[PDB]
Amino acid sequence: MIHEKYTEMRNEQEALLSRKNTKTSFYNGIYDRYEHPVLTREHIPLHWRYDLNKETNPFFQERLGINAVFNAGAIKLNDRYCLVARVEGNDRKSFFAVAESDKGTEGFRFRQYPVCLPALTDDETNVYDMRLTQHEDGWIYGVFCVEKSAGTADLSEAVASAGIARTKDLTNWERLPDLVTLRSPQQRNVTLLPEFVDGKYAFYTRPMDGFIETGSGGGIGFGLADDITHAVIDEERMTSIRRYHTITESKNGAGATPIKTERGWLNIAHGVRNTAAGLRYVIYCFVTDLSEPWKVIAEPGGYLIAPFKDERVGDVSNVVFTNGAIVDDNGDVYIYYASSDTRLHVAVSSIDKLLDYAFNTPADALRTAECVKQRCDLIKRNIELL
Amino acid sequence: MIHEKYTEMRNEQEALLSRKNTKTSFYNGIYDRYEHPVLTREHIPLHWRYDLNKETNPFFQERLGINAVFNAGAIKLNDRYCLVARVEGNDRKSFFAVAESDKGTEGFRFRQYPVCLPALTDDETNVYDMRLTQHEDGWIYGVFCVEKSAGTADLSEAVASAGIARTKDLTNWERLPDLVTLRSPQQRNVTLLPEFVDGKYAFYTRPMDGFIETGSGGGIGFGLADDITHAVIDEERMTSIRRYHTITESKNGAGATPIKTERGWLNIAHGVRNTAAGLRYVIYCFVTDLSEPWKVIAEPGGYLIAPFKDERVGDVSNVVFTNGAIVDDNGDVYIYYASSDTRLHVAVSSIDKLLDYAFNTPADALRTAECVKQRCDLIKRNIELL
Amino acid sequence: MIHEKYTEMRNEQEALLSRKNTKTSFYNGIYDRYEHPVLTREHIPLHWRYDLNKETNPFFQERLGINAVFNAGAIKLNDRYCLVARVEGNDRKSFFAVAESDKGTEGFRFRQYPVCLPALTDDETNVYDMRLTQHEDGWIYGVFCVEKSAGTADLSEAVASAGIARTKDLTNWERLPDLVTLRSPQQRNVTLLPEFVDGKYAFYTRPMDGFIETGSGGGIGFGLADDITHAVIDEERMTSIRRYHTITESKNGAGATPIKTERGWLNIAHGVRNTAAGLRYVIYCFVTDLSEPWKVIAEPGGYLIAPFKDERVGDVSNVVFTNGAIVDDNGDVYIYYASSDTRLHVAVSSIDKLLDYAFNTPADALRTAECVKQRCDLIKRNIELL
Ligand SMILES: OC[C@H]1O[C@@H](O[C@H]2[C@H](O)[C@@H](O)[C@H](O)O[C@@H]2CO)[C@@H](O)[C@@H](O)[C@@H]1O
Ligand SMILES: OC[C@H]1O[C@@H](O[C@H]2[C@H](O)[C@@H](O)[C@H](O)O[C@@H]2CO)[C@@H](O)[C@@H](O)[C@@H]1O
Ligand SMILES: OC[C@H]1O[C@@H](O[C@H]2[C@H](O)[C@@H](O)[C@H](O)O[C@@H]2CO)[C@@H](O)[C@@H](O)[C@@H]1O
């Protein structure tokens, strides 16, 4: 009763799922790239997409296609690397699905079902880009974007807010009230710090006047909420901010969940600028202080990751983006970065390498002549050494 | 007197023109993709582009280059597959030219000359995207876009209308009056149904407030005109409409000429949405009722064709588009879809396959949590089967 | 003390620097393309980017990355082909650096240091796109864009002006006052003619109302300044202008420095139009009269160079751009054109070939039906010949 075409395609999918991944020749001394994505639309199990029944699907047509797999939350759970992937259906709605592997760079396979995330209202059209936090209160929190129609004459006009849900296993989710930020009508790129700050739940936020353009909103905010089960933030203290003629000029936002180090919170974030071709997204780092996490204590000039080779092209070209990283006990760091809103990659680094990058890459000299003086200082050091 | 360089380039062009095309490994159970485009700028005969005379063209320079070949009307005519291609010159003006083959997927060759299409006014700057209709009144009609300067201070401001011309052979064309739509100042993506409706000429239309943004214009309209030689439409009844967070959010429009089936009119159309990289065009289907062709009776969620691999990049990236299909008597369907406003491809399907897609692909569940429930229902069916 | 990783990477860089370049199969009878760029981010010497000291750079991390190398001025200097490249750092600021080769198409190597260009004010954030002029007054002039924050609430709002500097060697630069144009608040794509006109310094200019959109500004202007050391232009006489539905519709600007020929000034310039994917840049030619250099005496329809194959994609896709060419005494012409604001290419032609293109390529027929008549005339000539 299973269509004859299924077995051959299932065998091909199994081959893909198991395919080795290889470190490429890319080098910057900070992280490694890999030949293949860790997740693509073709990693979604065939029986999530095809009706296997030859009676009701005689031609074995794809009934529910997958358009893209990207922007994934990431966490280590019972010694497996777990990705809470943003999966965009053929119908253009995204949903979460979990893939796991015993390796950080290959072999990811989706669980039996996608994520059932309870809706709070009847007009939640999309949910996306979940950041996962292993919180000291004992829960795993997912903080994600919730998008609703604005209900105006402009059909494309939408409103973003931060959803909050918690879990022990990434299968069973308790949906808490959406975050309220008293000083901003919309939020995106919100993420929860793993530790209390002054006994409160602490977030990096991103206040926005609109759905695309931020305001008013000058950068990544830091905010405190008394109660995660009724989360309300008032003040949003600016941390890493938009700066003219830098990678963060148009807007910026937190990326991966804040990473705890002895030297501060390592924030792998994204910056946006406008070009003749549209918006360009890159990934950068900044470190915030442990006792004062609204205070930036390191921010290199420029980017850490930008679209490279085949990363440059996809549904939304000229974009790399991350909302997930995994840190192993030995200090290995797996940065899951998507490209062009289409596919998901991994970059492999370490805490020592990322901290050296963050603290020892020169700060942005901001103006061309000072940038040259800065680079000439380096050249002169090297020439002496030679 | 013919430049020595001509013979070698002519031999290379002949090799291209005759080159076999091969079905690729792409699979969705609905249509096949092919390795090569059916038409490109290099398919245009060398002697349409080069001055062959070595006296007046000593260096054998390309005098009238071709920039792109795309958005083609299509019709079967004396047992040949005929494409009325949109050919964009080096000078950025498009014109129509006919290519024919005895095969639907390869071997297309242009006729001796491009199309001489009489202008009605002295300010018709561009004509493009012709839909061909084999009408029951015995004529072949071409319905195309006519673009004129708006004549304002904004040099780029333009006005679109629907031109109508008829022919028996795609060489000799009678230019009729442009369509008038009393309730809309502009039109694009207009196409004529092959059959009368209540004794009148019937069109799918696309009312627009502006040259790029539609309004006001909520989707694809259905309209009736008493007289094709003085075509005037009043009411435009909405059919497939723009829907928030779907592939048709920003705008949509008819694509290929309506295809007659026993189950309704099969409309292979396009949907547009905005992204950080600009507008994204995909192709989708909807079926309208035979007795009430303003009434949509099937509309899958999502798209049928989206830019894939090398289709993604060109003059206008992230676009696929069709205004032509050919249906053989045995039910084979050839969908001619262009990518990125640069080149023309073919997708091969059948009426049975396209109808199964159209009626049996789940309708858009519109909101993420309902999309998941819908996909989980499919997964659960397949797991039981297993 | 030099990190062990340096030697292997230095050997790989040397291999790149020396790599042969090969003419491709591209043909239009006017210019040749080459397989490889003449300059990329990887051509920048490793010791401009890495700290070679293993004590201060234990992981051998890239401290000052290079994002792109493009839009280069070009001049022949002591029998070497010299490129004053726009080098964009990882931090998104550009600066000038000179590369030289004894061949026009390969083997380019950067000098010991980038260019130290004195700033006039403390708010010069970026400088870019220098056009080099070997002037009859005995100096080499560089005319470049100077960009400053507009200082408004809009962080991205910027102001462009034309900087002027002179040199004998491309190392030691005297920075003169920025050009003042009394009738336009901003300027970009300004270039100095190599000869006096009526005893004055003569420029092609590009008046602009804004930083991105021109106005008001209708095309490329011609202006005269009494004193290059206090350069002030009043009237800007229009030359090549924006034309609806041509490659120059949205805006245009001078490209490479005007090239002296017996038949007029050969201007290799750029044209811009808007598309669904963003702005598209192509390169075209026009010739101005020797005695009246505000007067256009040849302007082909269409473009000379457009993005081709891998040129199409980069930081700013769908762009080719030039602000540098080198003319050898034997008439060989090297056009240095960048693609997608990422990398720098060379196109090789000759004065005889470029003049034949400029004067004998049909003028734009402006409207589709007249474009067809024009092409049919050519076809008919060729068919007779056959
Ligand atoms: O698209 C690039 C990035 O934009 C953000 O999101 C999108 C979102 O993915 C779209 O579905 C929606 O239509 O509009 C948003 C535009 O901001 C960013 O946070 C990422 O989600 C995305 O990669
Ligand atoms: O460009 C994508 C699609 O846009 C529509 O047309 C263009 C037209 O091709 C351009 O020449 C003109 O400048 O503006 C229009 C923008 O809508 C669409 O119907 C297709 O023609 C085209 O593939
Ligand atoms: O980007 C395409 C072309 O735009 C012009 O310049 C840019 C400039 O390079 C950017 O750094 C700045 O942010 O905005 C300008 C937009 O016009 C053009 O003259 C070239 O510089 C560039 O290739």
mmCIF file with all atom_site columns, C-alpha atoms in Angstrom, chain C residues 187-191 193 197 202-207 216-224 235-243 248 252-256 258 265-270 284-300:
data_model
loop_
_atom_site.group_PDB
_atom_site.id
_atom_site.type_symbol
_atom_site.label_atom_id
_atom_site.label_alt_id
_atom_site.label_comp_id
_atom_site.label_asym_id
_atom_site.label_entity_id
_atom_site.label_seq_id
_atom_site.pdbx_PDB_ins_code
_atom_site.Cartn_x
_atom_site.Cartn_y
_atom_site.Cartn_z
_atom_site.occupancy
_atom_site.B_iso_or_equiv
_atom_site.pdbx_formal_charge
_atom_site.auth_seq_id
_atom_site.auth_comp_id
_atom_site.auth_asym_id
_atom_site.auth_atom_id
_atom_site.pdbx_PDB_model_num
ATOM 1  C CA . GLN C 1 187 ? 28.726 65.231 -5.624  1.00 0.00 ? 187 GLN C CA 1
ATOM 2  C CA . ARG C 1 188 ? 29.883 61.724 -6.502  1.00 0.00 ? 188 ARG C CA 1
ATOM 3  C CA . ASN C 1 189 ? 31.682 60.257 -9.548  1.00 0.00 ? 189 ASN C CA 1
ATOM 4  C CA . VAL C 1 190 ? 33.648 63.430 -10.197 1.00 0.00 ? 190 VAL C CA 1
ATOM 5  C CA . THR C 1 191 ? 36.666 63.164 -12.489 1.00 0.00 ? 191 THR C CA 1
ATOM 6  C CA . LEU C 1 193 ? 40.033 65.856 -17.547 1.00 0.00 ? 193 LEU C CA 1
ATOM 7  C CA . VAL C 1 197 ? 39.857 73.712 -21.252 1.00 0.00 ? 197 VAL C CA 1
ATOM 8  C CA . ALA C 1 202 ? 37.734 70.752 -16.283 1.00 0.00 ? 202 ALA C CA 1
ATOM 9  C CA . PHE C 1 203 ? 35.623 68.076 -14.577 1.00 0.00 ? 203 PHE C CA 1
ATOM 10 C CA . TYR C 1 204 ? 32.783 65.725 -15.277 1.00 0.00 ? 204 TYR C CA 1
ATOM 11 C CA . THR C 1 205 ? 30.491 66.013 -12.260 1.00 0.00 ? 205 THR C CA 1
ATOM 12 C CA . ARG C 1 206 ? 27.285 64.415 -11.072 1.00 0.00 ? 206 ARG C CA 1
ATOM 13 C CA . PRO C 1 207 ? 25.010 66.844 -9.207  1.00 0.00 ? 207 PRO C CA 1
ATOM 14 C CA . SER C 1 216 ? 16.947 67.419 -10.059 1.00 0.00 ? 216 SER C CA 1
ATOM 15 C CA . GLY C 1 217 ? 20.322 65.954 -11.025 1.00 0.00 ? 217 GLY C CA 1
ATOM 16 C CA . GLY C 1 218 ? 19.613 64.931 -14.608 1.00 0.00 ? 218 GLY C CA 1
ATOM 17 C CA . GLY C 1 219 ? 22.923 63.365 -15.636 1.00 0.00 ? 219 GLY C CA 1
ATOM 18 C CA . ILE C 1 220 ? 26.677 63.803 -15.903 1.00 0.00 ? 220 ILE C CA 1
ATOM 19 C CA . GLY C 1 221 ? 27.696 67.456 -15.744 1.00 0.00 ? 221 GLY C CA 1
ATOM 20 C CA . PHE C 1 222 ? 30.655 69.321 -17.234 1.00 0.00 ? 222 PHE C CA 1
ATOM 21 C CA . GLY C 1 223 ? 32.204 72.091 -15.112 1.00 0.00 ? 223 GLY C CA 1
ATOM 22 C CA . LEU C 1 224 ? 35.229 74.406 -15.057 1.00 0.00 ? 224 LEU C CA 1
ATOM 23 C CA . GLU C 1 235 ? 27.604 75.911 -13.955 1.00 0.00 ? 235 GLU C CA 1
ATOM 24 C CA . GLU C 1 236 ? 27.391 72.162 -14.537 1.00 0.00 ? 236 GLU C CA 1
ATOM 25 C CA . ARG C 1 237 ? 26.470 71.627 -18.178 1.00 0.00 ? 237 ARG C CA 1
ATOM 26 C CA . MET C 1 238 ? 24.560 68.391 -18.789 1.00 0.00 ? 238 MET C CA 1
ATOM 27 C CA . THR C 1 239 ? 26.238 65.809 -21.044 1.00 0.00 ? 239 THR C CA 1
ATOM 28 C CA . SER C 1 240 ? 25.095 62.155 -20.924 1.00 0.00 ? 240 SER C CA 1
ATOM 29 C CA . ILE C 1 241 ? 21.719 62.223 -19.170 1.00 0.00 ? 241 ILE C CA 1
ATOM 30 C CA . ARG C 1 242 ? 19.252 59.831 -17.527 1.00 0.00 ? 242 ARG C CA 1
ATOM 31 C CA . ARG C 1 243 ? 16.802 58.426 -20.058 1.00 0.00 ? 243 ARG C CA 1
ATOM 32 C CA . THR C 1 248 ? 20.699 55.116 -17.249 1.00 0.00 ? 248 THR C CA 1
ATOM 33 C CA . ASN C 1 252 ? 24.349 57.619 -14.093 1.00 0.00 ? 252 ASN C CA 1
ATOM 34 C CA . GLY C 1 253 ? 27.875 58.853 -13.476 1.00 0.00 ? 253 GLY C CA 1
ATOM 35 C CA . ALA C 1 254 ? 31.335 59.134 -14.980 1.00 0.00 ? 254 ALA C CA 1
ATOM 36 C CA . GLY C 1 255 ? 33.412 55.995 -14.551 1.00 0.00 ? 255 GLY C CA 1
ATOM 37 C CA . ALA C 1 256 ? 37.014 55.889 -15.706 1.00 0.00 ? 256 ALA C CA 1
ATOM 38 C CA . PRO C 1 258 ? 38.185 60.640 -19.658 1.00 0.00 ? 258 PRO C CA 1
ATOM 39 C CA . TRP C 1 265 ? 37.024 62.177 -25.091 1.00 0.00 ? 265 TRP C CA 1
ATOM 40 C CA . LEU C 1 266 ? 36.116 58.530 -24.508 1.00 0.00 ? 266 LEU C CA 1
ATOM 41 C CA . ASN C 1 267 ? 34.109 58.245 -21.319 1.00 0.00 ? 267 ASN C CA 1
ATOM 42 C CA . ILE C 1 268 ? 33.617 54.787 -19.842 1.00 0.00 ? 268 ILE C CA 1
ATOM 43 C CA . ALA C 1 269 ? 30.760 55.453 -17.439 1.00 0.00 ? 269 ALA C CA 1
ATOM 44 C CA . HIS C 1 270 ? 28.052 53.680 -15.434 1.00 0.00 ? 270 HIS C CA 1
ATOM 45 C CA . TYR C 1 284 ? 28.525 52.124 -20.978 1.00 0.00 ? 284 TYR C CA 1
ATOM 46 C CA . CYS C 1 285 ? 30.418 54.585 -23.201 1.00 0.00 ? 285 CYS C CA 1
ATOM 47 C CA . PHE C 1 286 ? 29.876 58.051 -24.555 1.00 0.00 ? 286 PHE C CA 1
ATOM 48 C CA . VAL C 1 287 ? 32.247 60.346 -26.445 1.00 0.00 ? 287 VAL C CA 1
ATOM 49 C CA . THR C 1 288 ? 32.436 64.084 -25.907 1.00 0.00 ? 288 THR C CA 1
ATOM 50 C CA . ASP C 1 289 ? 33.838 66.627 -28.340 1.00 0.00 ? 289 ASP C CA 1
ATOM 51 C CA . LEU C 1 290 ? 37.448 67.818 -27.974 1.00 0.00 ? 290 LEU C CA 1
ATOM 52 C CA . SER C 1 291 ? 36.743 71.532 -28.460 1.00 0.00 ? 291 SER C CA 1
ATOM 53 C CA . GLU C 1 292 ? 33.377 71.347 -26.686 1.00 0.00 ? 292 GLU C CA 1
ATOM 54 C CA . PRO C 1 293 ? 33.662 68.644 -24.004 1.00 0.00 ? 293 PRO C CA 1
ATOM 55 C CA . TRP C 1 294 ? 30.125 69.326 -22.705 1.00 0.00 ? 294 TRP C CA 1
ATOM 56 C CA . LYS C 1 295 ? 28.835 68.121 -26.061 1.00 0.00 ? 295 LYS C CA 1
ATOM 57 C CA . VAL C 1 296 ? 28.078 64.426 -26.540 1.00 0.00 ? 296 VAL C CA 1
ATOM 58 C CA . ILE C 1 297 ? 28.977 63.287 -30.060 1.00 0.00 ? 297 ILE C CA 1
ATOM 59 C CA . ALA C 1 298 ? 28.446 59.517 -29.686 1.00 0.00 ? 298 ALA C CA 1
ATOM 60 C CA . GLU C 1 299 ? 26.316 57.431 -27.317 1.00 0.00 ? 299 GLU C CA 1
ATOM 61 C CA . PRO C 1 300 ? 25.430 53.846 -28.261 1.00 0.00 ? 300 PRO C CA 1
#
